[PDB]
Symmetry: D2
Subunit: 117 residues, 4 copies
């Protein structure tokens, strides 16, 4: 019975209209007692550009999170230069009962993100 | 004439993003420290002139931090992103680079322009 | 259903619920648009059953999103009275996701699977 | 002294990070009596992906306009396909005193637009 993470992502390569497979993503959360980023998990996107199992319901607490997408390495492996060596998306979770989809739609020279559910 | 420019557009309201704080940094490639080059605030056209001089514009990895949560809160609204940082590599130093931020409360995009 | 969509209201970070979407196919001889389906997005901003797998033939399609009516029911104006995305389908074995991410003064779309 | 069109555009090719040069653009306005699109101007973008003189101050009245971008043609002269054979942005003008910038930021498999000033 497959466990469903409340935080999901999707990487789409908009230049060829295909998923962003095999991109390294690192999730962090700011520690409020110190003021430092704590690493939570590191994953590699699957062939559908997604990264299931980012975090459990119990660990998904209110806080500030950072997702780092290794875009420079992603494009390097495709044999291409990228304008952005990495992409960090920093976001505030206050409502913990909701699903948060935090995707990266990217080309070599542009990207976008949105909050969804 | 800054070789690096920006423009902030509030896509929720279709107006320039005025008075947003933007800090430009340059990476120390040998350590991995970020150095602050310029701190500015966008004007009523959403622009930030004089981000850097021609003479200080060398190849390297630069970051612009845009103070998005502070911008939205001043307008009476929350933002999903406490700040946005765009990190980009400069190799060819004779080109102009336009690095804009197009944002709502819950989205943002950027593109490399000239 | 090999064609799917998703409407995101990126001003509020919520699904774009109750938006009318009309799907057409171009008559490749006359240049007429033939209506295929008229739907309304659900609470999750999706429109299931846009086309059936049998009826999904190659050619040029248009999805029309009634954006001006969507914002109007929300008590707001939209720069765009409607949005039409026109695309060419050459391979009918694939899934095509044709979404609309919109605010009152912007929008974007992406070919997805 | 230069006459500036109240309606401007900019086409940006976001897969290469260059201006979308030599893109055909056709501006229409909805006819008040027939319910038909009337062609106003046809142009080709310049080397900076822009099209000065889309319309005169005097022709720019309250209305519903459509900007058509020949994206299929544009990509084809670069030797590639596009998912969209053309792109039309239909927009309402009520306030005739403001400047309107209606850009197109395009890859072969994505595009975006915004209302600007």
């Amino acid at each position: 019975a497959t466990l469903l993470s409340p935080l999901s992502t999707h990487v789409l390569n908009i230049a060829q209209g295909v998923p962003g497979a095999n991109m390294t993503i690192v999730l962090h959360r700011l520690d409020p007692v110190s003021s430092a980023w704590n690493i939570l998990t590191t994953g590699i996107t699957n062939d559908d550009g997604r990264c299931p199992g980012l975090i459990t319901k119990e660990n998904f607490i209110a806080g500030v999170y950072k997702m780092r997408f290794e875009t420079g390495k992603y494009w390097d492996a495709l044999g291409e230069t990228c304008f952005y060596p990495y992409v960090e998306i920093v976001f505030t979770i206050t409502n913990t009962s909701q699903h948060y989809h935090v995707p990266l739609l990217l080309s070599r020279f542009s990207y976008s993100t949105t909050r969804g559910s």
